[PDB]
Structure formats: C-alpha cells, structure tokens
Amino acid sequence: MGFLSGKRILVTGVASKLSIAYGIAQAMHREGAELAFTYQNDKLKGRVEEFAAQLGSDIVLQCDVAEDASIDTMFAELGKVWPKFDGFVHSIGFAPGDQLDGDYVNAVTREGFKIAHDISSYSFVAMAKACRSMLNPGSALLTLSYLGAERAIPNYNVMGLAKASLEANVRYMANAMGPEGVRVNAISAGPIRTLAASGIKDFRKMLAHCEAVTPIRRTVTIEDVGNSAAFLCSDLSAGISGEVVHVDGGFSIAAMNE
Amino acid sequence: GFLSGKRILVTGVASKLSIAYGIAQAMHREGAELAFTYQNDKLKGRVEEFAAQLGSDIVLQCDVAEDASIDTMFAELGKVWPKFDGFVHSIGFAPGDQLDGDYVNAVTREGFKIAHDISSYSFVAMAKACRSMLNPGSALLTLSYLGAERAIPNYNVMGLAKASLEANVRYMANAMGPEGVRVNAISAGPIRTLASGIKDFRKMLAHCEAVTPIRRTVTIEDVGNSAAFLCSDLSAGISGEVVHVDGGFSIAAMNE
Numbered sequence: 001m002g003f004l005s006g007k008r009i010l011v012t013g014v015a016s017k018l019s020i021a022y023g024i025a026q027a028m029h030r031e032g033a034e035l036a037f038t039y040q041n042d043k044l045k046g047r048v049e050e051f052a053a054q055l056g057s058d059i060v061l062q063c064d065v066a067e068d069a070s071i072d073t074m075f076a077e078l079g080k081v082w083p084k085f086d087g088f089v090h091s092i093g094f095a096p097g098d099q100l101d102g103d104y105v106n107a108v109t110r111e112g113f114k115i116a117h118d119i120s121s122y123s124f125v126a127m128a129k130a131c132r133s134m135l136n137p138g139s140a141l142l143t144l145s146y147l148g149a150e151r152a153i154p155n156y157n158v159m160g161l162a163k164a165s166l167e168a169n170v171r172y173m174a175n176a177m178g179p180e181g182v183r184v185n186a187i188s189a190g191p192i193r194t195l196a197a198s199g200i201k202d203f204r205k206m207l208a209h210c211e212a213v214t215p216i217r218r219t220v221t222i223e224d225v226g227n228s229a230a231f232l233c234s235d236l237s238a239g240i241s242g243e244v245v246h247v248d249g250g251f252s253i254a255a256m257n258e
Numbered sequence: 259g260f261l262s263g264k265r266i267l268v269t270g271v272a273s274k275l276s277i278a279y280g281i282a283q284a285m286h287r288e289g290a291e292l293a294f295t296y297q298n299d300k301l302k303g304r305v306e307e308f309a310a311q312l313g314s315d316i317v318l319q320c321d322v323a324e325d326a327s328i329d330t331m332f333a334e335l336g337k338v339w340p341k342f343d344g345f346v347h348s349i350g351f352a353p354g355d356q357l358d359g360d361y362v363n364a365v366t367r368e369g370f371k372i373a374h375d376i377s378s379y380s381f382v383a384m385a386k387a388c389r390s391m392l393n394p395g396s397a398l399l400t401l402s403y404l405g406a407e408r409a410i411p412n413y414n415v416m417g418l419a420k421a422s423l424e425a426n427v428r429y430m431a432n433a434m435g436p437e438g439v440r441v442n443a444i445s446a447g448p449i450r451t452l453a454s455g456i457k458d459f460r461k462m463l464a465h466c467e468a469v470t471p472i473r474r475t476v477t478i479e480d481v482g483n484s485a486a487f488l489c490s491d492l493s494a495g496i497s498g499e500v501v502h503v504d505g506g507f508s509i510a511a512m513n514e
C-alpha cells in the first residue's frame with residue numbers, strides 16, 4: 001500500500017485529461033485513495049463518470065459551486081455513501097473571459113470582480129462549511145492558486161485578486177479548522193496548458209519565455225502538482241497547514257534572466 | 259509643505275478619531291488642497307464641518323457600492339478640479355455578524371460578497387472613474403491590515419477582502435504606472451477608531467503595546483504622516499508597495 005491508503009478524497013474540477021484535477025486524481029488513486037468526483041454541467045457528466053470509472057469510482061455527483069443549495073445537495077448525496085470522509089480538492093476557477101483581455105483597470109467591472117471572487121475564492125469555504133461535520137480527524141483540504149495572487153501579471157487582472165483572497169482563505173480556514181484535526185493548504189502551480197489556457201492571449205510565447213527563466217528549466221506538469229497535492233492531502237504532510245506551496249519549478253523565487 | 263501644489267481627494271472620514279481625519283489634517287499641514295466625500299446623509303454634516311476647518315469647500319456624496327454614485331461624484335468634482343493629483347481610499351466594511359467567532363461558521367456568500375465589494379473593488383472602481391483626471395505624478399493610497407497576510411481571530415473575511423485589496427494595489431500600480439500614477443497601501447496597526455466598533459477584545463487586543471517593538475500601538479498621526487509622504491513626490495520611487503505602519507509588530511514573533 002502507498003500513502004493515502006485509508007483515505008477518502010473528493011476531487012472537483014475534472015473537466016479533461018489535461019485538467020490539473022485529473023493529474024491530482026491519478027496520483028491520489030495510484031497512492032491508493034478511494035476517490036469521489038464532481039462536475040458542473042451535464043455536458044461534463046459523461047466525461048467525469050468515465051474518468052471516475054477508470055480510477056475505480058462509482059461516486060460522480062453534480063455541483064455548481066455558485067449555489068449554496070447545489071453544494072448542500074451534493075454533500076448529502078455523498079453522505080449516503082461516504083457518511084464521513086477525509087477531505088477534498090478545490091480545483092475550481094473562473095472569471096468572465098473578457099475580464100482577462102487587456103489593461104486591468106479597463107477590463108475590470110463590479111460584476112467581473114464578484115463572479116471571480118465568488119467562484120475562485122469563496123467557493124472553497126462554501127464547500128468546507130457544507131461538509132465540515134463529515135470530515136475525519138487528520139483530514140486535509142487543498143486548493144490551487146497562481147503567482148498572480150502575489151504579483152501583478154499582465155492580463156491576469158481580477159483573477160489575481162480572487163487568488164489573493166483565496167490564499168488568505170486558506171490561512172483563515174486552516175486557523176479555524178486546525179483544532180478539530182483539519183489542515184488546509186494550497187498549491188501555487190506554475191503555468192500549464194489546460195482548459196484555463198484558452199482563449200488566453202500570447203499563451204504559447206508566455207510558456208516559452210517561462211521555461212527559459214524557470215530554474216528547473218522546464219514548465220511544470222499535472223503529474224508534478226498531482227504528486228505534491230497527494231502529499232499535501234496525506235499524513236506525510238501532518239505538519240503543514242495554512243501554507244501556499246509553490247509547485248512552480250522555482251520560477252517565483254528567481255528574477256532577471258538572462 | 260512637501261504636499262504643496264497637490265490636490266488630493268480624501269474619503270472615509272466620519273469622526274475626529276477616523277483614520278482619514280488624521281491623514282487629511284496631516285495632508286493639510288503640508289500645504290495640500292483637499293476635497294472630501296461622505297457616504298450618507300448621516301455623515302454629511304460632520305464631513306462638511308471638518309472640511310471647513312481645513313479650508314475646503316469641496317464636499318461630495320459618494321457611496322462606493324453604486325457605480326453611478328462614484329461617476330456622479332467625480333463628475334461633480336470635475337467642475338472644480340478638472341484634474342487633480344490622486345485620492346485616499348480609507349473605506350472598509352463587512353456585516354457585523356461576519357466579524358465574530360469561528361471564521362468558517364461566521365462567513366456567508368453575501369457577507370463575503372459585500373466585504374470584497376466595499377473593501378477591495380471600490381478602490382479600483384474609483385480609480386477607473388477618475389483615470390482621465392489624474393495628473394502625471396498622481397498617487398493613490400488605500401489602508402490595509404495584517405489580517406490580509408495572517409489569520410487574525412475575529413477578523414475573518416475582512417482578511418480575505420484586505421488580501422484582495424493588497425493584490426488590487428499591485429495590479430493598479432502596474433496598469434496605471436505608465437501614465438505617471440502610483441498606487442500604494444499602508445498596512446496600519448490597530449487603532450481605537452473605527453468608528454472596530456463592536457469588536458471583541460478589543461482593549462485586550464490593544465495590548466499589542468507589550469509586544470510591539472516601539473512599545474506602543476500606532477496613532478492616527480503616524481498613519482497620517484506616512485500617508486502624506488506616500489502621496490507626495492518624496493515617494494516617487496515607491497509604487498505598488500504595502501508599507502507596514504504598525505511599529506514593527508508584523509516583523510516580530512513570540513515577545514512573551
């Protein structure tokens with residue numbers, strides 16, 4: 001048996017075999033976790049049920065994180081099979097496409113700001129509120145952030161604020177839930193070409209420039225972050241809570257190349 | 259006055275204890291011309307009174323929850339200050355219920371929505387509205403708290419809003435830099451005002467004094483001076499920065 005052996009983990013945001021959530025699910029199953037999955041729309045229902053079936057999982061439940069009721073119904077359905085379980089992965093992020101186009105202060109709008117912060121930052125607590133009573137002692141919660149939280153990156157715009165809010169969310173959640181044996185962490189992942197990479201401007205050239213100046217000298221993959229994710233949600237990470245772990249290849253800690 | 263020749267809009271003054279009151283009169287002392295805003299009909303009188311005490315005639319209605327109110331405010335300001343040299347963003351709010359006890363139990367979607375709407379978005383929304391009017395060498399300022407960067411009990415979602423605000427500072431600074439605009443934040447230490455009203459320690463909290471390097475909590479005058487400096491040409495080399503004005507409380511750990 002590998003680590004995460006006796007663990008039951010819920011994985012959100014699996015929209016593709018390219019999704020970060022797929023890479024994470026693969027690693028967690030390889031390490032022997034019993035998984036459950038969610039999907040937003042009925043367009044995804046077909047795909048997620050198969051990825052879940054490949055990974056050996058009967059549990060595949062709809063959930064749009066915009067709605068408090070949707071979240072409650074999902075954890076009620078999950079309760080029928082998983083009365084208690086050992087945490088979940090928050091791999092959801094959205095902001096109206098047009099918000100990420102050009103100059104930040106031009107693009108940004110009150111509604112763009114709301115949706116971005118609601119879906120990418122609050123969604124994480126909403127979900128933790130709904131299943132708090134089901135979490136086992138020693139359980140672990142994980143989310144995914146980007147360097148845009150810490151720095152001003154062109155055309156990332158409002159998402160950077162949502163991610164900043166999210167990283168603070170990890171901190172407060174970890175602090176609130178610590179005492180009851182629950183750890184909350186985040187992975188600040190490097191740039192990967194997934195469903196969130198389109199229709200982003202200059203994404204090809206951005207990865208090329210990013211792979212030249214990142215110390216490890218390659219762009220990170222969904223396997224690398226899946227591995228860290230599995231570790232963060234495992235008892236090997238029992239001493240880590242409220243932390244924003246950079247699975248960056250070392251990009252963020254360098255400056256001025258070449 | 260190192261702030262002389264500058265016209266700066268100060269918001270969020272509602273009391274002599276108010277943090278913007280300290281900033282305004284520090285800004286006044288250094289020869290700046292000031293304009294003010296008030297959120298409510300309730301505040302109008304007090305903001306008019308202090309505006310008069312600082313030699314200002316420009317006092318305008320502005321609720322930053324409404325885009326129309328902001329645009330009407332800057333439209334009304336345009337008639338007197340067609341162009342000016344930036345503003346001070348001393349505004350924050352979450353429903354009171356949100357700032358009490360366990361964060362996860364306290365927080366709601368609506369409480370999160372308002373917290374972020376009023377405390378973070380309003381800052382850029384205001385910049386958005388007056389971007390046309392901002393002179394080269396203009397400077398924007400906002401006020402934050404350590405709860406952005408660490409988990410403070412009973413600060414709760416305000417910490418998330420503040421974190422968003424501090425990120426907003428960097429993005430605003432990066433976007434508006436090329437047009438000669440600077441955008442920074444003062445992360446102030448705890449002060450007795452607001453308004454902070456109905457907050458649990460609080461005086462227990464106010465005993466940071468024992469743990470804070472300078473052996474006291476920071477004052478409205480300390481923040482006022484720093485804010486004046488940050489909005490002057492003296493701080494021409496500083497942009498997108500979160501300057502901690504809390505007597506070095508943030509940089510210390512385990513002082514008994």
Ligand SMILES: NC(=O)c1ccc[n+]([C@@H]2O[C@H](COP(=O)([O-])OP(=O)(O)OC[C@H]3O[C@@H](n4cnc5c(N)ncnc54)[C@H](O)[C@@H]3O)[C@@H](O)[C@H]2O)c1
Nearest residue numbers: 013014015020040065091092093144145189192194195196
């Ligand atoms: N470059 C990257 O791709 C990158 C880097 C760092 C962090 N991340 C983060 O990782 C997470 C996954 O992003 P990705 O790009 O790897 O794959 P992705 O594009 O599939 O992620 C988006 C996910 O959001 C879900 N979704 C959208 N809105 C929803 C909502 N309100 N409720 C429920 N489901 C909804 C979809 O199922 C989808 O899987 C995001 O939070 C993203 O911010 C990605």
Ligand SMILES: NC(=O)c1ccc[n+]([C@@H]2O[C@H](COP(=O)([O-])OP(=O)(O)OC[C@H]3O[C@@H](n4cnc5c(N)ncnc54)[C@H](O)[C@@H]3O)[C@@H](O)[C@H]2O)c1
Nearest residue numbers: 270271272276277297321322349350401402449451452453
């Ligand atoms: N006092 C502290 O302990 C402390 C510490 C660090 C930072 N700050 C920050 O300083 C700023 C002002 O706080 P203060 O201590 O001066 O108390 P205060 O109560 O005087 O300031 C809050 C201000 O928000 C304004 N306001 C509320 N909702 C509004 C809206 N939608 N539109 C327009 N105006 C609205 C009020 O008029 C008021 O002037 C806040 O942003 C707070 O986050 C305060």
Ligand SMILES: Cc1c(CN(C)C(=O)CCc2cnc3c(c2)CCC(=O)N3)oc2ccccc12
Nearest residue numbers: 093094095096097146155156191196198199200
């Ligand atoms: C990296 C990187 C990403 C990936 N990433 C870390 C993200 O957080 C992406 C977030 C995202 C949120 N909402 C939407 C989209 C992407 C695409 C299309 C859409 O309609 N909505 O996106 C960027 C956008 C601009 C700059 C860099 C990046």
Ligand SMILES: Cc1c(CN(C)C(=O)CCc2cnc3c(c2)CCC(=O)N3)oc2ccccc12
Nearest residue numbers: 350351352353354357403412413448454455457
């Ligand atoms: C310091 C400090 C403050 C002050 N501060 C830095 C803040 O950033 C905001 C305080 C605040 C924001 N919104 C409201 C209230 C206080 C009271 C009543 C109300 O209706 N809304 O508040 C705290 C709350 C808990 C712990 C510390 C603090």
